[PDB]
Amino acid sequence: GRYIGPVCRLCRREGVKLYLKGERCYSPKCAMERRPYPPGQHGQKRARRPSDYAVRLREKQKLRRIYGISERQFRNLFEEASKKKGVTGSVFLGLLESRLDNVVYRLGFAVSRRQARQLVRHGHITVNGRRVDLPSYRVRPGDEIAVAEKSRNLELIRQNLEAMKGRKVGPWLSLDVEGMKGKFLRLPDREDLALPVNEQLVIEFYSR
Amino acid sequence: MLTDPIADMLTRIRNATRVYKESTDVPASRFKEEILRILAREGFIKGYERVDVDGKPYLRVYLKYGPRRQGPDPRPEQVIHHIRRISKPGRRVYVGVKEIPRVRRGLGIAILSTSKGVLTDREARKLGVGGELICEVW
Amino acid sequence: DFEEKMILIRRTARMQAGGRRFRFGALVVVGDRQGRVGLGFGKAPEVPLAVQKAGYYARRNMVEVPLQNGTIPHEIEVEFGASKIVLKPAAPGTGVIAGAVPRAILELAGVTDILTKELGSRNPINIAYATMEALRQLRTKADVERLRKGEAHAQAQ
Amino acid sequence: VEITVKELLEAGVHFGHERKRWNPKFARYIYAERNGIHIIDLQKTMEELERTFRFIEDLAMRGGTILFVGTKKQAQDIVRMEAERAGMPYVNQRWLGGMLTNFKTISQRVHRLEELEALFASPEIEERPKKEQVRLKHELERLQKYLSGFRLLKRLPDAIFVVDPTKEAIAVREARKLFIPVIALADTDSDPDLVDYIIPGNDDAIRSIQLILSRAVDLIIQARGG
RNA sequence: GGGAGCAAACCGGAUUAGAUACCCGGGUAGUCCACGCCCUAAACGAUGCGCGCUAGGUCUCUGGGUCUCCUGGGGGCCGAAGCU
RNA sequence: AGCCGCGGUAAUACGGAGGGCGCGAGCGUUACCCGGAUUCACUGGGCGUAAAGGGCGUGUAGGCGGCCUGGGGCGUCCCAUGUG
Numbered sequence: 024g025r026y027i028g029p030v031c032r033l034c035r036r037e038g039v040k041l042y043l044k045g046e047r048c049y050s051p052k053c054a055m056e057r058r059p060y061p062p063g064q065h066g067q068k069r070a071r072r073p074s075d076y077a078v079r080l081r082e083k084q085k086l087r088r089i090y091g092i093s094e095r096q097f098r099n100l101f102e103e104a105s106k107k108k109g110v111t112g113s114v115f116l117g118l119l120e121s122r123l124d125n126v127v128y129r130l131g132f133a134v135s136r137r138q139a140r141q142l143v144r145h146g147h148i149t150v151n152g153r154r155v156d157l158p159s160y161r162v163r164p165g166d167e168i169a170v171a172e173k174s175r176n177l178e179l180i181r182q183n184l185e186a187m188k189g190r191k192v193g194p195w196l197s198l199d200v201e202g203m204k205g206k207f208l209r210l211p212d213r214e215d216l217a218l219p220v221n222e223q224l225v226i227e228f229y230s231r
Numbered sequence: 232m233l234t235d236p237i238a239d240m241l242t243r244i245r246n247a248t249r250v251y252k253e254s255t256d257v258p259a260s261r262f263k264e265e266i267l268r269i270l271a272r273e274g275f276i277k278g279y280e281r282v283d284v285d286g287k288p289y290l291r292v293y294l295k296y297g298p299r300r301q302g303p304d305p306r307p308e309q310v311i312h313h314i315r316r317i318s319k320p321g322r323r324v325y326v327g328v329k330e331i332p333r334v335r336r337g338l339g340i341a342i343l344s345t346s347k348g349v350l351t352d353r354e355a356r357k358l359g360v361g362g363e364l365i366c367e368v369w
Numbered sequence: 370d371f372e373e374k375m376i377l378i379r380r381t382a383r384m385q386a387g388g389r390r391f392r393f394g395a396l397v398v399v400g401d402r403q404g405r406v407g408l409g410f411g412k413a414p415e416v417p418l419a420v421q422k423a424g425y426y427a428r429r430n431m432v433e434v435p436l437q438n439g440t441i442p443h444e445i446e447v448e449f450g451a452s453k454i455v456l457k458p459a460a461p462g463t464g465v466i467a468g469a470v471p472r473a474i475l476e477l478a479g480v481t482d483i484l485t486k487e488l489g490s491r492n493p494i495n496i497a498y499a500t501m502e503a504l505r506q507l508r509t510k511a512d513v514e515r516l517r518k519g520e521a522h523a524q525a526q
Numbered sequence: 527v528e529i530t531v532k533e534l535l536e537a538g539v540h541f542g543h544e545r546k547r548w549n550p551k552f553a554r555y556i557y558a559e560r561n562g563i564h565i566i567d568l569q570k571t572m573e574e575l576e577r578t579f580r581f582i583e584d585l586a587m588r589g590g591t592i593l594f595v596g597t598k599k600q601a602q603d604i605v606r607m608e609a610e611r612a613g614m615p616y617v618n619q620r621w622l623g624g625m626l627t628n629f630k631t632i633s634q635r636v637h638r639l640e641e642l643e644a645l646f647a648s649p650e651i652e653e654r655p656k657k658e659q660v661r662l663k664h665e666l667e668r669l670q671k672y673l674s675g676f677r678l679l680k681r682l683p684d685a686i687f688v689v690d691p692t693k694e695a696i697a698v699r700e701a702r703k704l705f706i707p708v709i710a711l712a713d714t715d716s717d718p719d720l721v722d723y724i725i726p727g728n729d730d731a732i733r734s735i736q737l738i739l740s741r742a743v744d745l746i747i748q749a750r751g752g
Numbered sequence: 753g754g755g756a757g758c759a760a761a762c763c764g765g766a767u768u769a770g771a772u773a774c775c776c777g778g779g780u781a782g783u784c785c786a787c788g789c790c791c792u793a794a795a796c797g798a799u800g801c802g803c804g805c806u807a808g809g810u811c812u813c814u815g816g817g818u819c820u821c822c823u824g825g826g827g828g829c830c831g832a833a834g835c836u
Numbered sequence: 837a838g839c840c841g842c843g844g845u846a847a848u849a850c851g852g853a854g855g856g857c858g859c860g861a862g863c864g865u866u867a868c869c870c871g872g873a874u875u876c877a878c879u880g881g882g883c884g885u886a887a888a889g890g891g892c893g894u895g896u897a898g899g900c901g902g903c904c905u906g907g908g909g910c911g912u913c914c915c916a917u918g919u920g
């Protein structure tokens with residue numbers, strides 16, 4: 024299935040915050056905040072040089088975890104941007120944002136990505152006016168990501184549809200706060216997304 | 232016995248240069264003349280002059296070089312960094328247009344014999360024909 | 370002020386009456402990823418005394434690089450020893466594909482994209498200045514029509 | 527001042543060296559072999575002397591510090607009294623592999639001379655036990671020997687000046703590396719592409735040496751007003 | 753056919769712990785000629801064979817010329833460029 | 837235990853534990869195909885010592901070839917077309 028387990032420990036594995044714990048992950052709690060060093064018995068001891076391949080892999084893992092999809096199809100998404108006409112680093116992401124489970128988490132309707140998924144899986148979501156239980160979902164420019172009326176008066180929807188009067192979307196996006204709607208303007212750029220990944224280093228792991 | 236009129240020339244001018252000889256002389260063909268007019272159309276060589284060495288017919292090619300480099304090896308740069316022939320005899324090499332390659336990512340020249348004669352991949356493809364693929368300079 | 374990766378280290382043997390004696394050797398890069406890049410090879414009695422020294426030789430052993438949209442201007446090949454080094458420009462998005470040691474040297478010199486193979490003998494050190502030379506020898510669409518033609522330049526351009 | 531064909535001749539400048547000890551690249555520069563031992567074309571020293579005085583005149587107008595190198599036992603005390611007149615640094619005695627690609631390691635030895643001149647001035651020397659006294663004496667002159675031209679070389683020279691680019695093809699090969707320009711006086715037994723600013727003329731003629739330095743060291747001082 | 757001298761095998765003497773060897777005194781094959789076989793070799797520059805191109809220096813054998821030197825063909829050594 | 841290798845009382849290598857990395861309804865092992873392997877070398881190799889120049893010639897099939905112009909257009913290039 025999906026990975027399911029001790030999430031804020033990769034808040035610390037690759038050494039920087041991955042906001043996957045979600046609304047806690049802006050505390051002086053999310054695990055990183057306390058103890059930067061990554062897991063078990065040794066995590067505090069002196070860390071030596073990382074192999075050329077170490078680093079090659081770290082920065083791949085980060086981007087795989089951070090987006091909350093498992094390897095086997097993190098691949099067919101890479102290998103589907105390769106097969107596509109344009110910059111490979113920049114196409115890749117481009118079809119991470121078009122996935123449904125992170126079409127929500129940037130459209131507001133959730134606290135973290137792992138949560139944001141549940142709402143997709145469970146019949147809660149509208150796509151060009153229909154119900155989609157499919158995180159694997161290719162959201163195109165002009166699509167309509169909303170909520171089905173039935174779930175609307177749920178707290179989790181709403182405390183989150185709240186806070187959005189203090190934030191903004193992401194410039195490829197209109198949020199319709201009140202009407203509970205959302206619109207996919209275009210794809211992103213590598214202009215926008217300021218992730219803590221370096222993407223060529225990802226591709227240099229999918230060269231070997 | 233003597234086999235390759237052509238490959239021979241290259242190797243004179245090869246060995247000629249890498250010594251930094253001002254001038255060097257090669258057994259007057261019609262081919263060797265038309266290949267040569269290229270090599271100065273495209274500034275690898277200053278130019279060839281027809282000269283008779285011992286009442287025998289010949290071509291005097293003058294040699295182009297780099298400029299006085301410094302360092303501890305003050306020896307320039309053959310404008311001809313590598314010249315070498317592809318259609319070898321008994322082992323020949325005929326390319327269409329599709330099959331005409333480009334040399335050093337466009338920085339260089341491939342020489343052709345075509346139904347319209349003595350041609351560079353640029354002049355070659357611009358013309359839209361091909362044939363025996365000959366040598367290769369840069 | 371020069372960022373500097375490190376390629377390889379080794380312990381080498383001398384000898385003597387009663388037991389061996391040694392010395393260590395350190396292969397080091399350098400390079401402002403926009404243009405330049407050096408290499409050193411350093412020997413010294415205790416290790417990071419060498420690794421430090423190897424950094425020295427690289428500062429003098431510098432090679433400006435013709436760079437062009439993070440890539441290599443033309444194709445290229447060079448021998449040095451029986452270790453045969455290949456480079457070749459890659460497009461935007463293909464990026465430092467190259468084994469162990471060109472990566473180290475190409476990256477730090479500043480290449481985004483490149484293609485690459487290593488040949489026959491693979492000993493680091495040869496393939497090191499295999500490529501230090503491969504790069505000393507890159508030539509530019511202008512450095513070039515002003516090597517040739519440039520007999521009478523500025524009548525042409 | 528200026529120079530003619532007339533003057534060079536009497537010196538023995540056409541007077542080349544052998545054909546048995548001979549550098550092929552020296553081609554361009556000869557007339558022939560009147561008795562197997564070559565004759566330099568001085569109408570091709572007028573060429574490489576013009577140009578190779580212009581370059582010296584510029585350097586004395588942008589005040590350059592020009593090394594002097596002659597070790598061939600006749601050369602020496604003519605290198606000398608022709609650098610001294612010029613205000614210069616000269617390696618007359620014996621070149622050292624280093625003195626250019628190692629100016630530091632060497633120049634840690636000037637100061638050790640300059641320290642020892644001054645140590646010998648004061649009275650505190652005599653206090654040191656007289657074993658060291660004569661001992662540390664020796665070291666004084668050693669340094670005055672192989673350096674009494676090096677001292678005034680406080681940094682790295684704008685051009686080195688050889689009389690034999692084959693004896694000290696050592697030196698020439700240093701200033702090869704550390705991109706200094708080279709100014710050499712060469713007969714035929716000497717690679718002439720290893721020099722940028724070159725004089726074809728006699729290696730060992732103690733009158734060919736003599737004119738050329740004493741006519742160089744003019745278009746130094748004249749070009750530095752005086 | 754020939755057999756002086758040399759000399760596997762072989763006969764003795766000596767050395768050595770033992771000596772079927774090293775050392776010594778003889779010894780047939782055989783090396784020698786023929787005529788037919790045998791057809792291997794560290795048969796070795798351990799570099800198959802022709803032609804064209806690329807600093808030279810000395811040495812040496814052999815040719816030709818207006819022979820202080822020039823120019824052909826060989827055998828050697830040291831060295832440019834370049835190869836390794 | 838795939839390779840070099842670890843174990844002869846301080847085992848990061850064996851068996852357990854805690855901890856760790858990678859993957860996930862699959863994760864491993866065995867068998868076969870290609871890559872690696874420019875280790876069959878058209879692209880893309882080599883023989884002095886490293887595996888390798890025939891022990892030397894002759895010459896047949898076959899492979900290959902100098903300068904000047906012209907006829908053929910078999911190859912090779914080019915365009916239209918039928919097929920794939």
Ligand SMILES: [Mg+2]
Pocket residue numbers: none
């Ligand atoms: Mg699945």
Ligand SMILES: [Mg+2]
Pocket residue numbers: none
């Ligand atoms: Mg239901």
Ligand SMILES: [Mg+2]
Pocket residue numbers: 450451
């Ligand atoms: Mg090789």
Ligand SMILES: [Mg+2]
Pocket residue numbers: 489490
């Ligand atoms: Mg190998």
Ligand SMILES: [Mg+2]
Pocket residue numbers: none
């Ligand atoms: Mg006997």
Ligand SMILES: [Mg+2]
Pocket residue numbers: none
């Ligand atoms: Mg018989």
Ligand SMILES: [Mg+2]
Pocket residue numbers: none
């Ligand atoms: Mg017989």
Ligand SMILES: [Mg+2]
Pocket residue numbers: 791
């Ligand atoms: Mg026989």
Ligand SMILES: [Mg+2]
Pocket residue numbers: none
């Ligand atoms: Mg046999």
Ligand SMILES: [Mg+2]
Pocket residue numbers: none
């Ligand atoms: Mg043979």
Ligand SMILES: [Mg+2]
Pocket residue numbers: none
């Ligand atoms: Mg000879």
Ligand SMILES: [Mg+2]
Pocket residue numbers: none
């Ligand atoms: Mg050499």
Ligand SMILES: [Mg+2]
Pocket residue numbers: 847
């Ligand atoms: Mg134990």
Ligand SMILES: [Mg+2]
Pocket residue numbers: none
């Ligand atoms: Mg264990």
Ligand SMILES: [Mg+2]
Pocket residue numbers: none
């Ligand atoms: Mg293969």
Ligand SMILES: [Mg+2]
Pocket residue numbers: 881882
């Ligand atoms: Mg091989």
